[PDB]
């Protein structure tokens, strides 16, 4: 049997979940019967976003229709597609790429989670919860419900629900502290660096194994700087109604996976609209979209010398901003290091 806590056994068979990586290549439109999770290679993913970085372009400095029309062929036949009884829609309209462009990234992780799933799991002294485990290079222990890192998430979970997502309740069913291997190695050079805050950052169950064995990364080369509103970086939110919507979760499916990491932001480049971004200011280390809404810093906590914005959700006195929550995004794969996994339900 598994020498792991019960609570992890059910964290590694939740994450290497079959039938759940198949369902997120559904919605996403695939059609699993050309297209099935054996079939998934990131050469194919990476071509695929090249196709999607030519056509982005094609739409925007008005190229012939011909041009597009070639494009969404090579990119459908790439990655088959299921409409169904309706016509394939071609990939003419930019909002409509940038959701090519998301998928493209969920499949980077479904693939890692696959592969890694079907290999090596040929021990017998080992269960196979415990192999897994294994698999993912990351030390993974419960935190107590009791503890006072425990009671400082709890109440950053319950204060950052704003009032317009209100649409659901969330229950922390249990957190995790985690470690990925040499993590924390790569990450010393930015405990340098000021504001250093643990934000969170959401992502669908089926991401995870990617997420806990390669960490969290920029997406790669080939991949439009358009297909991301801030460019090509880390994602991270204050609130966790912001990062909840990324989890995907619903009625049908209320168990969702969030992460807490230490974020290296320092000089903080703020924005009120979206912006390509390639490089950054000197001077500056991080993006700080900045929203209507956002934790009462008066409210502001540390743990173990990081700020914890655990404030209830207040108005910011900017208003001439796009969005509506705050929005904090690095460039480079070493400035986070994750310290917590939740495992949440949602209650519609």
Request: glycine share 6%.
């Amino acid at each position: 049997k598994s020498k792991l806590a019960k609570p992890i056994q059910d964290l590694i068979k939740m994450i290497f979940d079959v039938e759940s990586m198949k369902k997120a290549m559904v919605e996403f439109e695939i059609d699993l019967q050309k297209m099935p999770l054996g079939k998934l290679s990131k050469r194919q993913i990476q071509s695929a976003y090249s196709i999607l970085n030519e056509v982005q372009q094609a739409v925007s400095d008005g190229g012939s229709e011909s041009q597009i029309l070639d494009l969404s062929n090579r990119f459908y036949t790439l990655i088959p597609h299921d409409f169904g009884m309706k016509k394939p829609p071609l990939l003419s309209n930019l909002e409509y790429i940038q959701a090519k462009v998301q998928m493209l990234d969920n499949l980077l992780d479904i693939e890692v989670a696959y592969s890694l799933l079907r290999g090596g799991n040929e021990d017998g002294d080992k269960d196979p919860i415990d192999i897994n485990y294994e698999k993912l290079r990351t030390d993974i222990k419960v935190v107590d419900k009791d503890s006072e890192e425990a009671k400082i998430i709890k109440q950053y979970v319950k204060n950052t629900h704003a009032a317009t997502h209100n649409a659901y309740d969330l229950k922390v069913v249990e957190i995790f502290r985690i470690e990925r291997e040499g993590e924390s190695q790569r990450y010393k050079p930015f405990k340098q660096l000021h504001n250093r805050q643990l934000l969170w950052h959401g992502s669908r169950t089926t991401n995870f194994a990617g997420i806990l064995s390669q960490g969290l990364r920029i997406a790669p080369p080939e991949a439009p700087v358009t297909g991301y509103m801030f460019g090509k970086g880390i994602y991270f939110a204050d609130m966790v109604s912001k990062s909840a919507n990324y989890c995907h979760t619903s009625q049908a499916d209320p168990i969702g996976l969030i992460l807490l990491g230490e974020v290296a932001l320092g000089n903080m480049y703020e924005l009120k609209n979206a912006s390509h971004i390639t490089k950054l200011p000197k001077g500056k280390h991080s993006v700080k979209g900045l929203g209507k809404t956002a934790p009462d810093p008066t409210a502001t906590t540390t743990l173990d010398g990081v700020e914890v914005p655990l404030g209830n959700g207040i108005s910011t006195g900017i208003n001439d901003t796009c969005l509506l929550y705050n929005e904090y995004i690095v460039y480079d794969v070493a400035q986070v290091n994750l310290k917590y996994l939740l495992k949440l339900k949602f209650n519609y």
